Structures are given as structure tokens and as C-alpha cells.
Enzyme design. Structure first.
Site, mmCIF file in Angstrom:
data_model
loop_
_atom_site.group_PDB
_atom_site.id
_atom_site.type_symbol
_atom_site.label_atom_id
_atom_site.label_comp_id
_atom_site.label_asym_id
_atom_site.label_seq_id
_atom_site.Cartn_x
_atom_site.Cartn_y
_atom_site.Cartn_z
ATOM 1 N N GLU A 242 -5.546 -4.792 10.720
ATOM 2 C CA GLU A 242 -4.756 -3.611 11.025
ATOM 3 C C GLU A 242 -4.834 -3.251 12.487
ATOM 4 O O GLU A 242 -5.884 -2.853 12.979
ATOM 5 C CB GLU A 242 -5.254 -2.409 10.240
ATOM 6 C CG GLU A 242 -4.807 -2.286 8.811
ATOM 7 C CD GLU A 242 -5.612 -1.228 8.093
ATOM 8 O OE1 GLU A 242 -6.743 -1.533 7.679
ATOM 9 O OE2 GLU A 242 -5.138 -0.085 7.975
ATOM 10 N N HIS B 287 -9.668 0.507 4.627
ATOM 11 C CA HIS B 287 -8.390 0.833 5.259
ATOM 12 C C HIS B 287 -8.621 1.753 6.450
ATOM 13 O O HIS B 287 -9.459 2.649 6.407
ATOM 14 C CB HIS B 287 -7.417 1.482 4.273
ATOM 15 C CG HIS B 287 -5.999 1.475 4.743
ATOM 16 N ND1 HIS B 287 -5.456 2.491 5.500
ATOM 17 C CD2 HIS B 287 -5.020 0.551 4.600
ATOM 18 C CE1 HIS B 287 -4.205 2.191 5.801
ATOM 19 N NE2 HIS B 287 -3.916 1.021 5.268
ATOM 20 N N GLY C 198 1.041 4.838 15.617
ATOM 21 C CA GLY C 198 1.244 6.153 16.200
ATOM 22 C C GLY C 198 0.456 6.328 17.474
ATOM 23 O O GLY C 198 -0.326 7.268 17.597
ATOM 24 N N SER D 194 2.939 -2.744 11.185
ATOM 25 C CA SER D 194 4.321 -2.438 10.834
ATOM 26 C C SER D 194 5.086 -3.654 10.328
ATOM 27 O O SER D 194 5.368 -4.579 11.095
ATOM 28 C CB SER D 194 5.058 -1.868 12.039
ATOM 29 O OG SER D 194 6.459 -1.849 11.791
ATOM 30 N N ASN E 172 0.822 -1.216 0.000
ATOM 31 C CA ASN E 172 0.000 0.000 0.000
ATOM 32 C C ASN E 172 0.856 1.266 0.000
ATOM 33 O O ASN E 172 1.221 1.780 1.060
ATOM 34 C CB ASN E 172 -0.926 0.011 1.226
ATOM 35 C CG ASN E 172 -1.933 1.146 1.183
ATOM 36 O OD1 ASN E 172 -2.114 1.773 0.140
ATOM 37 N ND2 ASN E 172 -2.598 1.409 2.310
ATOM 38 N N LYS F 255 -0.034 4.055 -0.408
ATOM 39 C CA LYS F 255 -0.826 5.144 0.153
ATOM 40 C C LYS F 255 -0.623 6.346 -0.754
ATOM 41 O O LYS F 255 -0.422 6.167 -1.955
ATOM 42 C CB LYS F 255 -0.378 5.446 1.579
ATOM 43 C CG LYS F 255 -0.302 4.205 2.434
ATOM 44 C CD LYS F 255 -0.325 4.529 3.902
ATOM 45 C CE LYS F 255 0.020 3.306 4.701
ATOM 46 N NZ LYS F 255 -0.232 3.572 6.133
ATOM 47 N N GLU G 50 -7.235 4.284 7.474
ATOM 48 C CA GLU G 50 -7.219 5.687 7.118
ATOM 49 C C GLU G 50 -8.556 6.130 6.539
ATOM 50 O O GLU G 50 -9.027 7.234 6.814
ATOM 51 C CB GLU G 50 -6.063 5.960 6.154
ATOM 52 C CG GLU G 50 -4.707 5.943 6.859
ATOM 53 C CD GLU G 50 -3.575 5.517 5.956
ATOM 54 O OE1 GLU G 50 -3.704 5.693 4.727
ATOM 55 O OE2 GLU G 50 -2.548 5.014 6.478
#
Lengths: 248, 248, 248, 248
Positions: free
Chosen positions: A165, A95, A171, A211, A11, A13, A97
Site C-alpha cells: 500500500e 491495513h 490523499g 488506487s 476491500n 472497507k 487504516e
């Protein structure tokens, strides 16, 4: 006998331009992917065509998103038919995001999945619980509700793969280990076998969407219920090849 | 530049495919572009590159949307850089569907505009009130509120075009009375004059993003404060080569 | 304004009479109102005027409901104008009882809100899911659906407060777990940020309309996304002067 | 010997503010009502207290509605005790606007009537058939069912008066004549005498709740079974006095 073919998606992105992307495609095009691994690259929407044209027929192209209708008044959106029209055979859906940063709901996600699939497009369905959901121990609850929506909109699991995910380790100050990675993939395969069918759960690839780098891909890959990756940042570098060879 | 060159934008939205769009592109390429006019075609994101490659140099290509950063973990998004990297020079922001269907706030849109301009891209900022707002008389306030947020992010109007869209009536041939379109556009021009500069308002294109057919495009442009359109559906029909020539 | 001034609303509902309410009013008038807080008392419609006349200027009066037009053949109803004409500055709309006992639809409530704001009144828009909905996990969808309808009618959040009420558990001291109240309120703040503006969400009070006693009001406000309450029964008890000071 | 005291109510509905209302009260306060006529004013709920305070003790104050319990979790609603608490001695119940615009059922209306009455409050019970009910010729059926519900909840007719509302001639394109007004009041008195008692039917005032102005009040008033009015719009003007003197 989990004869599930290793799946490795990249991905990119919203990163790259013709130059860096073409350069990236050059490395994989010149790379030698295991005849036992399935590699897919998800370019920025504006470069789906570019990538597919420059991409070696061995590697599939995947959109990073799409809408739930073939055509319509939806400026900025694209449909599965265009994605197909550009030679792309996959679509990343749900996803983190898209769900969080952009607020895409499961309902809408469930509808894109059913449409993408109806359009004869493969679908990388993404799931995952946020930090607070993880802190509460609602991992199962959260991930089952999302998978369920995906399952109710999937009448054929051949064209789909699941990507878990651990948004809770994105983060946040929390780190996700390969063990707790397996833990989650376990339940997800357990959810399938029980809510779908034993076969589906045994064939459905459940890839890790956390990750992943060529340095940790071997560990994660050795996990029983982890039969693939959905690489983010590392999918933009030569290391992507090392991940393509993690199961090896 | 006092003489505001006519601006005809064609918003294809989420329609067409290579074949279809190819037939359309081939046409406009055979369509003479009067220097008295400035035409732009906004293809769906997947076909920005394709169209730009096939489309005539005299015609400019425009993304239908973009994000507010050059690069990042924003799956499904594209950056002004990418659009520009694909040869497109413009970007559509604030469109009716973007904020009213995908909930894009003025804030987000103001940031996209600032970033787009900062990236060397031209932008077509869209605005317009809803039916509840229209049937409230707060049409001027809402549109000014929207224009303010956009102007707050514009530092050079050389590569900027305003687009008013009567959301409470767009799509069919039910073109909202040309007087209503003139009232709003007139106030917007009076806004830029005082909030920016007489020159800016006397050089800034205020295109109509409402119902514009290959015929009604005459009386519409006939209005003093209407320097073009943001053609919706017709932008797909061969009658788009006419709306371009909305005079003589 | 980042610092969201604490908002303690007291919903008396249909209780009390002059004598009773007079004793209560006289009390709050002797109760020091910390600038760190914003207290409001919503008396039954018949006593709006009475309370406003007796109540302390530092405390604001709020109707518990209103209609969507200044005047009309709507026997038994009152207009925002009237409320304002009686010195009240706020109005409670969407309350649990209004829609769940008197069947007020979101539509009607959205119209009341739009009209109330347009009339110069401040409004406390209420939302919340039911037990059937809570026991369905569609709590976020239902509350967002409700917030959307309200936000669609708000053009200035300066005089607006959100009120989440856990209908499936309100009344007794059986205060729903503070975590459940935080989860919802947290999402609502994330809704306003994206659907409106970070500033709006960082300046909009999201008070808890559930079980709030003169004691439990501590751990409740203790949560990050809980800028106040919409006290039900206790708002009648002298323990309302405490819930106001839900800190130190 | 129908020694029924003329009854004239003024349903201001949702109209007015302190200013216009105080001005209205001034006219009646300075007016001279016939010692043989009973005048009642039904102010917006928020002005029941205001009106009673400014209203001359000779004129009674009436709420335009109320609920069926003394106190409770019913935001926006008020109870007969408050209405009494404010000096109001009457309550309008079953107004067509409450039944239709707000969907109040006969069951709930029957319960407010029984409660209002138990609370020692007079009750203006409203009845009336809609347009379609009139078109069918179901006037009797419809109005008897509503009156019955009122009668079953009335154990004392001293505190009650009936108001017939020809909702079928309210904004429908149909006009109600004084003859067909009497026709209906006839049956209603016939319903009482037969279902209640000869005396009750002879003493119970049945007022007209249709279009009434000082210009047509004389005609309607001369009707045998029409012993009063429930004025709407005209109750907001000086003309209300002329209606107060219609029987004269």
C-alpha cells in the site's frame, strides 16, 4: 516461471448495507471470473456472514481485521475462529487504516498474523510506507521491517499474500505510477527470495493496494511483480469485474 | 418517565460462535422477559446479524462498538447505520476494553455517541475509573469528566443508558462492595439532575458494569441508584436469565 | 489553546554555585522574555530556593527531580510540596540521567508525575531511546512505551510538557539531524491526538532535549513539531538567552 | 579516656516546609545546647540553604546526601561544593534509605565519602545490616564490609563520625535494645582500633542511628561505645532538645 495465480481482493472497507451490498454481490455472482484469477471480497465486519451467505461459493469472503486470541474480554473485536465460523477463509491484516488511523503496531499485527494463520485462515498481509517515509527514501527500510514482522509470523506462505500500500500516494498530493509500483513489488520479492527462500518469493503473490480502477488495472497488472490487486473504492462497483479481468 | 425500567445488558465480548451463541440465543428466547425489565444482548460484531435473526424480538441486539461516520475508508470498522441495518437498536461505547486496551479516547467516544444517536441508534455509554485513579480519590472527577464528554454529545436521553464499570476490579466473582457501586451511581444521578434535568436523572438508567453474577445480582440491584447491569462473563452463562430477574 | 507558546527549558544539572549561578541569574533577569515564549530554569536542588529568590518572576524555576509523596523517611529526597513551597512551579522527571545513571524506572517516574501534578506542580516529563534501541528501530515503541506510562498518570495536560532526548547523542555540538528530532516529535504529537485528544496534542509542547546550542537552536525550532528545547550545557552559557529567541 | 564530644544529628529526612522547618529552627535557636555536645541538622536538600540561614551559627547544617563529583551531567544530584557553598559543613552518607530504597552501592558510597572528604566537608557515614542479615548473625560481616569501604576512603577521621543503623529493627517487627546497640558499637570501635589505629578508634564518635526519643536517649547515651545519635522522626520536634541533653 511465475505461475502465480492472479489475486484480486475487494476491500469494501466501512461501506454499504444489506441493500447495496446484496446488490453488489448480485453483480459478481452473475459475473464470470477467470478460472485463472482468485477473487476475494472483504465486507464490513457486520456483513461477513451476510456476504458469505449471499456470495457465490466461487468467491471467498475475507474479514477486514481480527484479533490475536480465539476468545476473550475484547469488546468490539472478533477472532479468526468466528471469521472461520462465518465461512470466511481470509483476513486482511495490517491495513494502512488499521496501522495509522487506529494505531495498530507491527507487534500486534505480527501476533494477529501468527494467530490468524494458526487458526487456518488465509491472510492478506498489508504493508506500506507513509508520505514522509517516502519523502525520505526510506521505502525499503520501512517496508522490509513490516514484511519481516510478517515473515517471522509466517511458517507457511501458502495461506498468505502480500499487498503493498503506497500510503504515500493516498490523499497526499502525490500520485503513484505503475512503474514505481513494480519497483516496490520488486524489492519485496527480492526480500522474500533472500530472507525466506527462492521458491517462496516466486510463488508468493504480491498484490497492489493502491488506487486501482478498471481503467488502470490493465497497466498495473501487466507488471511482472504485480500479480494482483487489493481494490478499495472500485470494489464497491461493477467495475470490480473489469479489475477481475485486468491480467486479461 | 419516572419509573426507570430495569435494564439488563449482556456483554458477550469476543466469545462464542454460531453453535455456542445459538444454544445461548435459543435459551433466552425461552426466557420470559418481564415488562418490568429491559434486556439487551451485545454479540461480537461478526454475530450481530446472526443473533438478531435468531434472538427474540422482545430482546434487543446491540453492537459492542461502531465508528463515527455512516461510511468511509475505515477498514475493520462499522457504522451506526450498518448496526441499525442489521436490526440492532443499541450500541456499546466507551467500554473498559475499548479505551483501556485499544486506547479509544473520550473525544473519539463522544463523537461515536453523537453519531450513533444521530443515526437512530440507542447507545449504552460506558465509563469508570482505573485503580491508580480509584486509589487517588479522583474517581468522581474522572467519571464526571467522562460523563460530561458524553453528555456534551447527547441531545435526547430517551435512547441512552449509563454504564459505570469499576475497571480496578471486574471479571471474577470478586464483586466490588455494593456500597462503592452505589456511591458512584448516586453521584452520577445527581450529575444528570443538575447538568441536564431532574426528569432526565429520574428517567436515565445507570446500570452497573462491574462484577455481576447470577446471584450477587440481588444485593446489587437492591441499591437505590442501580437500575441494571452490563453483565460481562455471566452474560454468556445461562445465569444471565436470572440476573435479568434480579428481584423476587 | 492551539497556539502552543514556545517553551525553553534550561537544565543546569549539577553545575554552578551561588556566585556562578548568581551571575547567570542576574543576566536572564536583564533578558526580555517574549510573550511568544515560556522560559524555565531548572537549578540543582540545593539552589532551587536561591535561584527562585534571585530569578525574575517572568522566568519560572523548576526542580530537576522530586519524590512521589509529600513527606516520608526518604533521606536525600524532596517532595513536590517542598519544591512548590520554594516558589518553583515545575519539575523535571524522567531525565536521561535520572533513569540511565540512577536507574529510575518508568514506573517510579509515572508515580512521581502523578504526584507532582496532584500537588499543583507543573512537570516536564522526559523520554528518549538509547543507542542500542535507536540502532534497532524500536525508537518509536520505546518512546511510546515511555509516553504511555506518563500519560497514564496525567489527567490534565494544562501544566505538562514533553521532552524528547536523543540519549544516543546528547552533549556536544553534534546536534542530531533535525529530521530525526522531527520524526520522533511528530509521532508523539500523533500519539497524544489519538490517545488523548486533538486539542491536547495541539496544545501540548513537545520540546527537544537534545543538542541545542545558542545557534543551532534555529533550524531545530524551524521544524513543525518542535515547540522548544530542554537546553543542557548551553543553559549555563549566556547563549541561553538566545536559544530562548530561536526565531527572528 | 574517651573524651569524644557527644554528637547529635537530626535527620529530618524528607519532611517539612519553610513554615514547620522555620518553626523547628526557632525552637533549637532558642534552645541551649550543652557546650559539650555537637548538634547537626540534616534538612531536605531543598532547604539546606534555608536552614543554614535561619539556623544559629552554633548548630551545623548537614546535607542528607550528595554526589561524588564537583560538577556534571547529573540532574537532581548536588555536589559537596554546593553543600559547602550553602554553609553546610556536613553530609550524611550511606543512609539506609539511600542504600536500600534507592540502591546506592558501597562502591558509589565509598566514592562520595572520599570526594565529600576531599571537598573539606564533614561526613556522617552510615552503616547497618538489614533484617535478614541480622537473622543470619552476619551483623559483623555486613557492618565490617561497609565500614571498611568507608575507612579505605577516609584518610582523615577528624572530619567523620560513624552512625550505626539497626535497619533490622526498622519496620520489621524486631526491637533493638540499648545493650545490643552497644554490642554493635563495640565491634565497630574494635574494627577501627584494629584496622585503623588505637587513637582513631578512641576518638571516632560512633552514634546510634536507631529509634531515639527524649524518653530513651538517656539509656542509649549512657552506653560506653555510644557517643551520639542520628535522630530521625524525633529530630522534627521539640524533643530534639531533650536528646541534645541525653548524655546529661
Amino acid at each position: 516461471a511465475p505461475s502465480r495465480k492472479f489475486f484480486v481482493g475487494g476491500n469494501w472497507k466501512m461501506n454499504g448495507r444489506k441493500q447495496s451490498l446484496g446488490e453488489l454481490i448480485g453483480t459478481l455472482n452473475a459475473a464470470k471470473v477467470p478460472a485463472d484469477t482468485e477473487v476475494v471480497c472483504a465486507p464490513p465486519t457486520a456483513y461477513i456472514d451476510f456476504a458469505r451467505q449471499k456470495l457465490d461459493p466461487k468467491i471467498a469472503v475475507a474479514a477486514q481485521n481480527c484479533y490475536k486470541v480465539t476468545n476473550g474480554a475484547f469488546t468490539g473485536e472478533i477472532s479468526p475462529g468466528m471469521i472461520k465460523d462465518c465461512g470466511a477463509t481470509w483476513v486482511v491484516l495490517g491495513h494502512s487504516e488499521r496501522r495509522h488511523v487506529f494505531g495498530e503496531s507491527d507487534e500486534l499485527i505480527g501476533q494477529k498474523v501468527a494467530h490468524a494463520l494458526a487458526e487456518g485462515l488465509g491472510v492478506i498481509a498489508c504493508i506500506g510506507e507513509k508520505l514522509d517515509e517516502r519523502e525520505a527514501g526510506i521505502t525499503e527500510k520501512v517496508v522490509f521491517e513490516q514484511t519481516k514482522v510478517i515473515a517471522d509470523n509466517v511458517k507457511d506462505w501458502s495461506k498468505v499474500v502480500l499487498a503493498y500500500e503506497p500510503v504515500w500516494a493516498i490523499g497526499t498530493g502525490k500520485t503513484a505510477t505503475p512503474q514505481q509500483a513494480q519497483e516496490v513489488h520488486e524489492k519485496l520479492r527480492g526480500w522474500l527470495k533472500s530472507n525466506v527462500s527462492d521458491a517462496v518469493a516466486q510463488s508468493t503473490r504480491i498484490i497492489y493496494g493502491g488506487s486501482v480502477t478498471g481503467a488502470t488495472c490493465k497497466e498495473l497488472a501487466s507488471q511482472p511483480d504485480v500479480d494482483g490487486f487489493l481494490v478499495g473504492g472500485a470494489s464497491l462497483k461493477p467495475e470490480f469485474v473489469d479489475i477481475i479481468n485486468a491480467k486479461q
